[PDB]
Write an enzyme that holds these catalytic residues in place. Structure first.
Site, PDB file in Angstrom:
ATOM      1  N   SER A   1      31.118  10.020 121.067  1.00 11.60           N
ATOM      2  CA  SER A   1      31.092  10.862 119.651  1.00 11.60           C
ATOM      3  C   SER A   1      32.203  11.906 119.940  1.00 11.60           C
ATOM      4  O   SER A   1      33.221  11.514 120.160  1.00 11.60           O
ATOM      5  CB  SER A   1      29.735  11.284 119.609  1.00 11.60           C
ATOM      6  OG  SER A   1      29.457  11.732 118.203  1.00 11.60           O
TER       7      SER A   1
ATOM      8  N   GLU B   1      29.916   1.882 111.568  1.00 12.97           N
ATOM      9  CA  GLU B   1      29.885   3.250 111.680  1.00 12.97           C
ATOM     10  C   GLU B   1      30.821   4.056 110.965  1.00 12.97           C
ATOM     11  O   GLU B   1      31.639   3.578 110.179  1.00 12.97           O
ATOM     12  CB  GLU B   1      29.834   3.488 113.040  1.00 12.97           C
ATOM     13  CG  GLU B   1      30.829   3.348 114.074  1.00 12.97           C
ATOM     14  CD  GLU B   1      30.815   4.205 115.412  1.00 12.97           C
ATOM     15  OE1 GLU B   1      30.389   5.547 114.691  1.00 12.97           O
ATOM     16  OE2 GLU B   1      30.805   3.752 116.250  1.00 12.97           O
TER      17      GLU B   1
ATOM     18  N   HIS C   1      26.968   3.679 116.058  1.00 15.54           N
ATOM     19  CA  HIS C   1      27.326   4.929 117.227  1.00 15.54           C
ATOM     20  C   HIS C   1      26.627   4.905 118.420  1.00 15.54           C
ATOM     21  O   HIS C   1      25.572   4.901 118.668  1.00 15.54           O
ATOM     22  CB  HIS C   1      27.191   5.990 116.391  1.00 15.54           C
ATOM     23  CG  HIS C   1      27.936   7.373 116.605  1.00 15.54           C
ATOM     24  ND1 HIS C   1      29.233   7.317 116.470  1.00 15.54           N
ATOM     25  CD2 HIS C   1      27.481   8.573 117.270  1.00 15.54           C
ATOM     26  CE1 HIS C   1      29.742   8.605 116.996  1.00 15.54           C
ATOM     27  NE2 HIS C   1      28.598   9.091 117.453  1.00 15.54           N
TER      28      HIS C   1
END
Length: 297
Positions: A144, A238, A268
């Protein structure tokens, strides 16, 4: 085409999700990630250390080679996340790679805005190298926010005369703060995880007035000449898909050895759900093989 687990995991994520206008305050968000964080396998041992003034934990699965280390940068948007949230997934990355992970609890926004987390990272990496770890035996990995942070560390540390490590595995990297890519619409229905301008308000919180295109904030715009072999995982489904295509093509443009895998039907950091996702387990297996192929070269 789609696994029975990801269908069920998708359906659950969608069930337990907040409905977006909803402004969930920061520490309600923080407390949530913490409370739902999966517990590491109990064959993972851990050892708390302090690195660059930050809390860290060496994360060693069974079977590690001494001499080899992962610098690990956790996700959470630069605003949330911790050693506790990430120890599960990392210990399995430690397993797969047979390398111990250094799992940093770097300085989080908004109490500490950008470039605070980049400094922790750089300084953490310097710290590794000063424990006598040769660059050839090192790897940087993260998810992330932490997957962009990977690149922002490698760029920063290069500009600073630090040797590159053997590899860099960003997982679902958030490498562009200005959040503009086709995927924010095109992939948006199919993502049960990134919404937002939940992501928009994170950028807000981390930048705190800074140039969203700052190479260390958004490394999709940094000069990447010289960074070592990249393995980049993203999911098809995503909002950040574009981050990863843009970055792969930028790495290649810049001279970087770069392998983008887009894993169909995935969300994700689908990795983080290995206890219940054959793909998370598979993708972790693959992170480590590649940290291992980069180590044999």
């Amino acid at each position: 085409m789609a696994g029975p687990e990801i269908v069920k995991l998708k359906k659950i994520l969608r069930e337990k999700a907040v409905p977006p206008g909803t402004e969930v305050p920061l520490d309600v968000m923080r407390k949530g990630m913490e409370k739902v964080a999966f517990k590491a396998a109990d064959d993972i041992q851990v050892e708390q250390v302090t690195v660059a003034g930050c809390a860290a934990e060496w994360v060693r699965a069974p079977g590690c080679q001494a001499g080899k280390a992962i610098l690990y940068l956790h996700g959470g948007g630069y605003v949330m996340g911790s050693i506790n949230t990430h120890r599960s997934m990392v210990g399995e990355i430690s397993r797969a790679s047979q390398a111990a992970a250094l799992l940093l609890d770097y300085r989080l926004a908004p109490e500490h805005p950008f470039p605070a987390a980049v400094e922790d990272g750089v300084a953490a990496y310097r710290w590794l190298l000063d424990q006598g770890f040769k660059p050839q035996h090192l790897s940087i990995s993260g998810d992330s926010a932490g997957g962009g942070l990977v690149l922002a560390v490698l760029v920063s540390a290069r500009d600073q005369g630090l040797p590159m490590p053997a590899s860099a595995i960003p997982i679902s990297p958030w490498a562009d703060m200005t959040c503009t890519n086709d995927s924010f619409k095109t992939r948006a229905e199919a993502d049960p995880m990134v919404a937002p301008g939940g992501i928009n308000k994170m950028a807000a919180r981390y930048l705190n007035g800074a140039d969203a295109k700052h190479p260390y904030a958004s490394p999709n715009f940094a000069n990447l000449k010289g960074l070592p072999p990249l393995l980049i995982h993203v999911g098809r489904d995503e909002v950040l898909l574009d981050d990863s295509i843009k970055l792969d093509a930028k790495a290649k443009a810049d001279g970087v050895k770069s392998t983008l895998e887009i894993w169909d039907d995935m969300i994700h950091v689908w990795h983080a759900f290995h206890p219940m996702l054959p793909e998370g387990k598979q993708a972790i297996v693959r992170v480590g093989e590649f940290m291992r192929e980069q180590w044999a070269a």
